[PDB]
Amino acid sequence: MNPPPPETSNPNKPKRQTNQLQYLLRVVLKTLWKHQFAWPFQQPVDAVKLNLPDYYKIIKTPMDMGTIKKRLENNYYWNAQECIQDFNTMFTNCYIYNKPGDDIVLMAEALEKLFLQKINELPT
Ligand SMILES: Nc1cc(-n2ccnc2)c2cccc(O)c2n1
């Protein structure tokens, strides 16, 4: 049974649009989105469909690029570091649930190293 996906809006949370955050959507996410290994991360893990019934017993801070994309589109973040933490949560969760050298991990590691290249320099 899947849990509710993370929130993509919150009226109690302050919103902000920064140049670095606009770049995370325009440039960083939207190129990562099109990588051939992106598809497993474009939406919350469906642990029912995937027959991973232990997934949400292990992963208690789920995060995915579909959630991040909707957060960016919603101006949900206060700064770019908040978004970068979500990306790192997504990558870390994959490495926690899985084992080195698994197909899904090789996908995450390819996206993570792309992600690190793209955020190596942000606009000002
Ligand atoms: N064992 C798996 C399988 C996944 N997945 C989702 C769609 N195809 C593979 C997956 C996807 C994202 C994060 C993970 O930790 C995953 N772990």
Residue numbers in the entry: 43 to 166
Paper text:
The bromodomains (BRDs) usually serve as a module for recognition of acetylated lysine residues. The bromodomain and extra-terminal (BET) protein family has four members, including BRD2, BRD3, BRD4, and BRDT. Under normal conditions, BRD4 is involved in the regulation of transcriptions. However, BRD4 has been found to be involved in various kinds of cancers and other diseases, for its regulation of several oncogenic and antiproliferative factors, including c-Myc and Bcl-2.
To reveal the binding mechanism and facilitate further optimization, the complex crystal structures of several compounds in this category with BRD4-BD1 were determined. Compared to compound BDF-2141, compound BDF-2254 had improved potency due to the introduction of a hydroxyl group. The binding modes of these compounds in the pocket were almost the same, in terms of their shared part. These compounds formed direct hydrogen bonds as well as water-bridged hydrogen bonds. In addition, hydrophobic contacts were formed with the surrounding hydrophobic residues, including Trp-81, Pro-82, Phe-83, and Val-87, Leu-92, Leu-94, Ile-146.
